[PDB]
Design a protein around this ligand. Structure first.
Ligand SMILES: *[C@@H]1O[C@H](CO)[C@@H](O[C@@H]2O[C@H](CO)[C@@H](O)[C@H](O)[C@H]2NC(C)=O)[C@H](O)[C@H]1NC(C)=O
Ligand SMILES: *[C@@H]1O[C@H](CO)[C@@H](O[C@@H]2O[C@H](CO)[C@@H](O)[C@H](O)[C@H]2NC(C)=O)[C@H](O)[C@H]1NC(C)=O
Ligand SMILES: *[C@@H]1O[C@H](CO)[C@@H](O[C@@H]2O[C@H](CO)[C@@H](O)[C@H](O)[C@H]2NC(C)=O)[C@H](O)[C@H]1NC(C)=O
Ligand SMILES: *[C@@H]1O[C@H](CO)[C@@H](O[C@@H]2O[C@H](CO)[C@@H](O)[C@H](O)[C@H]2NC(C)=O)[C@H](O)[C@H]1NC(C)=O
Ligand SMILES: *[C@@H]1O[C@H](CO)[C@@H](O[C@@H]2O[C@H](CO)[C@@H](O)[C@H](O)[C@H]2NC(C)=O)[C@H](O)[C@H]1NC(C)=O
Ligand SMILES: *[C@@H]1O[C@H](CO)[C@@H](O[C@@H]2O[C@H](CO)[C@@H](O)[C@H](O)[C@H]2NC(C)=O)[C@H](O)[C@H]1NC(C)=O
Ligand SMILES: *[C@@H]1O[C@H](CO)[C@@H](O[C@H]2O[C@H](CO)[C@@H](O)[C@H](O)[C@H]2NC(C)=O)[C@H](O)[C@H]1NC(C)=O
Ligand SMILES: *[C@@H]1O[C@H](CO)[C@@H](O[C@H]2O[C@H](CO)[C@@H](O)[C@H](O)[C@H]2NC(C)=O)[C@H](O)[C@H]1NC(C)=O
Ligand SMILES: *[C@H]1O[C@H](CO)[C@@H](O[C@@H]2O[C@H](CO)[C@@H](O)[C@H](O)[C@H]2NC(C)=O)[C@H](O)[C@H]1NC(C)=O
Ligand SMILES: N[C@@H](CC(=O)N1CCn2c(nnc2C(F)(F)F)C1)Cc1cc(F)c(F)cc1F
Ligand SMILES: N[C@@H](CC(=O)N1CCn2c(nnc2C(F)(F)F)C1)Cc1cc(F)c(F)cc1F
Ligand SMILES: *[C@@H]1O[C@H](CO)[C@@H](O)[C@H](O)[C@H]1NC(C)=O
Ligand SMILES: *[C@@H]1O[C@H](CO)[C@@H](O)[C@H](O)[C@H]1NC(C)=O
Ligand SMILES: *[C@@H]1O[C@H](CO)[C@@H](O)[C@H](O)[C@H]1NC(C)=O
Ligand SMILES: *[C@@H]1O[C@H](CO)[C@@H](O)[C@H](O)[C@H]1NC(C)=O
Ligand SMILES: *[C@@H]1O[C@H](CO)[C@@H](O)[C@H](O)[C@H]1NC(C)=O
Ligand SMILES: *[C@@H]1O[C@H](CO)[C@@H](O)[C@H](O)[C@H]1NC(C)=O
Ligand code: NA
Lengths: 728, 728
């Protein structure tokens, strides 16, 4: 008989999905690494040529982590000595290789322990951050110009983000932005001087006699936040005799009145930059549009070009105000904003006009704007078939908004319902990436007549292997709760039989603007649980979930740990009533926000769940970071929202855990959700005499992603679930 | 019929063991608390009176934690605001109450956060330590005199010990010693300037937003040790001079050549003090006897009065050099030292003669010297019936060493074999404290004729209760290995049937000079396991154990983690071959040194044990403190014992844990065995892919003794054991 998808298959990646990650280098060619050799492809015909031999660096001496070819293709940046920091940050050493003279540059090399590096968008200038300061190199072999001198570890950050800005605002370590042709280099400077530090132990190798104490500026809810300044420097007028002059662009008065954040930076033209600022109370944001003045050499932001964005029901943007997409001349722009019905759609703005015009509408949402030409704007939305968990590419005619054309919907409706896209330089070509419900499919297309040029990768090899495996199926459907439809998905065991009762595991995340019910194909722990253990793994998107309008998303505003937790209990209650579910064997598990919800659910006293697993959960909002927490909860002060901060903790529900089996897991070096959060949960449970299972992972962070720990946690959780379900 | 001793009975202390804690205030009167009242008893007739009514401090405004009456009975020290620190240390607030004028003193009060306070041995002077400096009050209501000005938190300690001296050398927080009539105050000063700090998080109450980092000067093996200095100040001159001089007494040249410790301070007469020093390599100790020179106001120590104590086979003393007991004139003293045969006996020394005379001998050992009069020396030994696990009080005639009388052996041989004693001020009366094998029994005796005056507490109430419970029985015996006997004890289930096969739990400690096989009566976890779960709980005293001569005790010298581990494994083999043990169900558990032995045993690959529980175990000796570790292991350097230090870790046996079920438990605030020790064990197990169970206890230290955590850990361990033995 055919085998099933086993835990080992998941842990050792027996069945790998093939990808096709290309890098556009112009409007008609892209780079693709094959056999460790970098090839250059012509999009039109599909022909290629070798761009760089894999042997080119046989005696390099170091293991190359990654590479980056300059925009003009004259040089290649080689990254090595990679050392990871937080989610996006890391340091590394770099070397530059001249592709023309086929030589490795040995003079004025980028320093070791460099924190970030980037070529200008055009040409081959380089900007890098080292020791928290910004340096610029006009030529790979020439000495660098020091741009800033205030860089100081854990205090002043120039051109790179501090912990909270990296994690919650920019989702990037870099805080540098080259103007379109590379003339100017804008950058932010963060000051964490008064930000309190989180401290935790790091044990390191067995050989370290005394544990190390890691200390990082981390503002918990309501604590002092870092401050921010924004500068722009002209890199075409740098001197090796005089220090570079950075021009500051100050935030508008409506922002300077109190705490605020810099949340977006987007160049509109060679001499016009837009900046969006957000108040610490995240329901008011301001976009400034500034023009360079050759006369004074300053940047002026006319008030007439200011655009305000606010929310009366919640915060601004999905996680942060959306980015503007400027037209060629920079006189107008398109941006996704919630309309009057609470659905996110594309609005068209005049830079000096207050009112914008919505170009799309309907009870669905635009996920993102992907390309803009003078005749069409391309975007991805979940409009097709009214499925919020599906994604397709559309283009809209800018001269007639009633002319909307779906470009991916009908390519292969049964195999492909969740698309992502990558356009070439001038949107002449685009790569479509289908990630579900069938196996991932990568295709190349031409924009002029939307021709389907060819298939880049169809994963036919994986398809052949999976035919010999008893794979689970996925059901995507919805339930009605108070006239509103909420979607859920179920990973069903092979040969599913509706006349039998299956144990059920509810997989939950449920953070604000999240989506767990979708059409994406995945090979993960749930695949194994369904395929080998015959467990149904369900996920449900309730109030607070995204992509279905603010009525649903903002339902949890100032109220985390309420509706989203109740909705997961309601879903399980519904599921428990279905004929194929064993109501005596229903469990729940989650990681991060999902660990919090799982814990809140288990301590709700609903009596629906037999057991649950919480991995690295938040336990009380006052322990989590300010930017994320305050966005949904406001401030933890008696005059604002302190009462709800105190009523939404896991600890307060400790006694309700007496009737469930609970497994609490957490990495000791978790810099994101501090171990402290689980330490307080266990202490509260010990205090009320409730027994439970626990597991700490020494020196693991929020991902508990090292190879050995990854295998161990899933192995441990599998034994727990099977034991809870009475499975061999 | 007849209930068993359940887990709840143990955790709720339903069967209360009564004791009789009295405080001698003179040669014939003692204080005893009865119904929150403090009574004063006349030893001779047993009649009493109310010394301090319970309603005396009903309006004190604070809960009085403890009290202390001045030697002259004129004042009472009231301790409150008790805040615990390490094993012996704590801070508190104090008030002094005038017993005569029955009035509480309100002027010149002892400061809050006082680290230590002690009355002079005579009268009512007081010496206290506050902010690491010593202060003396001649009168309770008068201002204090500052003795030191160097005190500095975590750096300089005057009159109090640092962490390592408290835990391993003195077993006490105080480092000051009043001379017999209170004229002089001697004290030690510790300097931890270069001692590395152990740092760990303390989460505290849920209300604390950021965890606190606890930092404690703690020397791990081979690290920089604190240095020490000794001083004596004449307190009688305090009111005559502005700043009384603290005369330093320096260690001898033999000690100053390298790192060393001050290990004992004992006043001999009003003007003679003895000090014992120990080299960092703990097999060489020196005792200096110093006399006050009234002409120079200095203290001189004549080399002819110096006594050397060294060891060729191990360290000096059981845990440290033994204390001297001086005759009244201070010209000679008695001290326990191991004889040529390796057994610890009492030796009689002339202060200026190097050769001593042994006054006791035999293949047994003297446990301690309890009292010394002009005619008799009283001591406790395990000579009776050749049982190293028994304890009796003996009296030897100082004028005729052949005249030795056992004062407790035959009092009640069946019920009493483990005695402890408490003599009145001049040894006129003594309280005997029998702690096993039967119920504890407390009695009063007159030394003049060694007649029993009366029974103070016989625990008849508890005996009445226990008759309604199926209690387990205890067996104490030995097995012969290599021609030498090794003792063990077994807690046997009620109605034990040698024809059946019972599951077996080996309870282990096994640290150097320890003893787990004794005649003490206990109501603990094992009582429950044997009584309700019908599990035999055994303990074995193999190589390294104490009170049986140096041949056995010093067998583990420079070799921890070898013979004592092997001997526990062999003990299990010998037990299984007794015929009433189920070879398929043998477990092992231990706390502290016992956790290390348990882990080493489970990782030996012996195949003898099915499962095991290690609580707060040591995992690698370089992580534990210098004083304890180096005493047995020497220094972790290539020139000394590094190889054995690297060969005796739990981590190197990770792979073998694949053969057993392991539960690892550790308190996160353990200042003694750092959580780091279990953090490295779990990491090594994850790295080799071994599954196991774990449990951390938030903010608990090495004793995991808070009421809720105590109940939770034993409940957790009971489930693990029951599951391992298939005991639903
Ligand atoms: C990038 O754009 C900048 C700004 O438009 C160009 O710089 C200007 O060039 C003109 C000459 O054509 C000068 O008169 C201006 O003074 C320059 N402005 C500044 C701020 O320097 C620059 O030449 C462009 N670079 C490229 C490669 O096209
Ligand atoms: C942004 O949200 C805040 C807080 O929800 C709003 O400010 C006030 O908040 C307090 C409670 O924190 C309420 O009592 C007030 O009624 C709220 N409004 C005002 C004007 O004080 C604020 O209004 C929101 N901003 C926008 C544009 O909706
Ligand atoms: C215990 O009783 C004795 C004797 O009854 C008390 O000691 C004193 O004994 C002498 C002679 O017997 C009497 O003259 C005294 O009057 C007794 N003292 C007192 C204070 O009355 C002794 O006081 C009693 N001890 C206690 C603690 O109550
Ligand atoms: C405690 O020991 C430290 C040495 O570890 C002493 O500190 C040194 O003192 C000398 C003399 O004043 C200075 O020159 C050095 O710079 C100090 N070294 C360090 C590391 O601080 C200190 O004096 C001792 N304290 C006492 C009260 O004895
Ligand atoms: C009492 O005497 C001691 C010892 O001389 C004084 O302590 C010295 O104080 C000076 C000045 O502050 C320091 O330079 C020395 O290092 C200290 N030595 C010691 C051993 O502490 C103390 O200051 C005197 N107290 C008063 C009130 O004069
Ligand atoms: C406590 O002992 C001390 C030390 O022997 C006594 O002080 C000595 O007293 C004699 C008088 O007999 C003097 O000659 C010495 O000068 C004192 N020496 C010192 C260092 O002070 C003291 O008298 C004794 N206390 C009591 C109450 O007897
Ligand atoms: C892809 O194929 C085209 C042929 O259509 C290649 O030809 C172009 O470039 C050649 C050299 O790069 C020239 O010799 C040809 O004249 C030119 N032809 C046309 C019609 O432009 C092209 O180079 C190939 N591209 C790659 C990446 O191999
Ligand atoms: C970073 O922000 C700090 C916080 O305001 C600035 O420091 C100011 O406040 C300090 C106390 O926190 C004081 O020492 C000074 O009055 C003041 N300036 C300095 C240098 O401390 C600090 O200047 C800012 N640094 C930069 C580079 O912007
Ligand atoms: C950054 O550090 C590297 C590594 O030390 C330096 O490169 C050389 O590394 C070799 C070992 O591979 C050493 O023997 C050399 O001493 C290092 N220095 C040199 C000049 O070769 C590198 O030089 C450092 N980079 C910078 C910009 O200082
Ligand atoms: N810290 C959160 C970050 C996040 O949700 N993304 C980062 C910011 N972001 C996202 N999507 N867009 C953006 C950005 F545009 F703002 F960058 C999602 C994730 C997160 C939430 C928790 F409750 C928790 F316990 C842990 C945790 F890691
Ligand atoms: N640190 C040890 C202290 C001790 O064993 N007593 C303290 C010193 N002592 C004793 N008996 N007499 C003395 C003294 F006289 F030296 F004070 C025993 C105990 C101990 C040993 C370990 F291996 C461990 F992992 C933890 C632990 F707490
Ligand atoms: C590229 O290099 C790899 C080794 O890194 C080698 O196995 C492969 O054959 C090379 N590819 C080609 C096309 O030569
Ligand atoms: C540039 O500024 C730094 C720091 O302010 C200063 O030390 C350096 O000398 C300056 N260089 C020049 C050329 O002015
Ligand atoms: C509507 O349904 C929601 C949950 O979907 C529930 O909380 C609410 O009480 C219901 N009634 C109204 C008026 O919203
Ligand atoms: C003393 O106080 C206790 C309270 O613990 C009370 O029960 C007892 O009766 C009191 N006895 C006297 C003599 O005051
Ligand atoms: C101790 O502290 C308390 C509370 O702060 C204060 O009321 C009292 O006066 C202090 N006592 C002394 C002796 O300083
Ligand atoms: C003391 O111990 C050291 C270390 O083993 C040893 O070399 C030395 O000879 C010992 N001294 C004596 C007297 O045994
Ligand atoms: Na095609």
């Amino acid at each position: 008989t055919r085998k099933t998808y086993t835990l080992t298959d998941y842990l050792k990646n027996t069945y790998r999905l093939k990808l096709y990650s290309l890098r556009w280098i112009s409007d008609h060619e892209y780079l693709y690494k094959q056999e460790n050799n970098i090839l250059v492809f012509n999009a039109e015909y599909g022909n290629s040529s070798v761009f760089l031999e894999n042997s080119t660096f046989d005696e390099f001496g170091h293991s190359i982590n990654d590479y980056s070819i300059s925009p003009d293709g004259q040089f290649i940046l080689l990254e090595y000595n990679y050392v990871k920091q937080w989610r996006h940050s890391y340091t590394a050493s770099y070397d530059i290789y001249d592709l023309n003279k086929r030589q490795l540059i040995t003079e004025e090399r980028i320093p070791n322990n460099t924190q970030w590096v980037t070529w200008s968008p055009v040409g081959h200038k380089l900007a890098y951050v080292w020791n928290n300061d910004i340096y610029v190199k006009i030529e790979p072999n020439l000495p660098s110009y020091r741009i800033t001198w205030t860089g100081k570890e854990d205090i002043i950050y120039n051109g790179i983000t501090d912990w909270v800005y990296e994690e919650e605002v920019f989702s990037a370590y870099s805080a540098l932005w080259w103007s379109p042709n590379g003339t100017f280099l804008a950058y932010a400077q963060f000051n964490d001087t008064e930000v309190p530090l989180i401290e935790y132990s790091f044990y390191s190798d067995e050989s370290l006699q005394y544990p190390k104490t890691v200390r990082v500026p981390y503002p918990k809810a309501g604590a002092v936040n870092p401050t921010v300044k924004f500068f722009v420097v002209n890199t075409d007028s740098l001197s090796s005799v005089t220090n570079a002059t950075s021009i500051q662009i100050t935030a508008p008065a409506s922002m300077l009145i109190g705490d605020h954040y810099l949340c977006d930076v987007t160049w509109a033209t060679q001499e016009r930059i837009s900046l969006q600022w957000l108040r610490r109370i995240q329901n008011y944001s301001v976009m400034d549009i500034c023009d360079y003045d050759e006369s004074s050499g300053r940047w002026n932001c006319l008030v007439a070009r200011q655009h305000i964005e606010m929310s009366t029901t919640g915060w601004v943007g999905r996680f942060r105000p959306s980015e503007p997409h400027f037209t060629l001349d920079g006189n107008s722009f398109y941006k996704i904003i919630s309309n009057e019905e609470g659905y996110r759609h594309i609005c068209y703005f005049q830079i000096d006009k207050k009112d914008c015009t919505f170009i799309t509408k309907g009870t669905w949402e635009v996920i993102g704007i992907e390309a803009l030409t003078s005749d069409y704007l391309y975007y991805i939305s979940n409009e097709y078939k009214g499925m919020p968990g599906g994604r397709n590419l559309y283009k809209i005619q800018l001269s007639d908004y009633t002319k909307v054309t779906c470009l991916s919907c009908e390519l292969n409706p049964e195999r492909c319902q969740y698309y992502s896209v990558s356009f070439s330089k001038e949107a002449k070509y685009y790569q479509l990436r289908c990630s579900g419900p069938g196996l991932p499919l990568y295709t190349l297309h031409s924009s002029v007549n939307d021709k389907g040029l060819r298939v880049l990768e169809d994963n036919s090899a994986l398809d052949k292997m999976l035919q010999n495996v008893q794979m689970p199926s996925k059901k995507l459907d919805f339930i009605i709760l108070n006239e509103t439809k909420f979607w859920y998905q179920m990973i069903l065991p092979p040969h599913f039989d509706k006349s039998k009762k299956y144990p059920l595991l509810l997989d939950v995340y449920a953070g604000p603007c999240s989506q767990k019910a979708d059409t994406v194909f995945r090979l993960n722990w749930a695949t194994y649980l369904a395929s080998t253990e015959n467990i149904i793994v369900a996920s449900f998107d309730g109030r607070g979930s995204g992509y279905q309008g603010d009525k649903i998303m903002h339902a949890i505003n100032r109220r985390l740990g309420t509706f989203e937790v109740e909705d997961q209990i309601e879903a399980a209650r519904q599921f428990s009533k279905m004929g194929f579910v064993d109501n005596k064997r229903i469990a729940i598990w989650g990681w991060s926000y999902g660990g919090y919800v799982t814990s809140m659910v288990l301590g709700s006293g609903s009596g629906v769940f037999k057991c649950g697993i919480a991995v690295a959960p938040v336990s009380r909002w006052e322990y989590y970071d300010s930017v994320y927490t305050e966005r949904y909860m406001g401030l933890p002060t008696p005059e604002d929202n302190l009462d709800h901060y105190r009523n939404s903790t896991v600890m307060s529900r400790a006694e309700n855990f007496k009737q469930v089996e609970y497994l609490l897991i957490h990495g000791t070096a978790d810099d994101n959700v501090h171990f402290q959060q689980s330490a307080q949960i266990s202490k509260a449970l010990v205090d009320v005499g409730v027994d439970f299972q626990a597991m700490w992972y020494t020196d693991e962070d929020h991902g508990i992603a090292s190879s050995t720990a990854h295998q161990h946690i899933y192995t441990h959780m599998s034994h727990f679930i099977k034991q809870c379900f009475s499975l061999p």
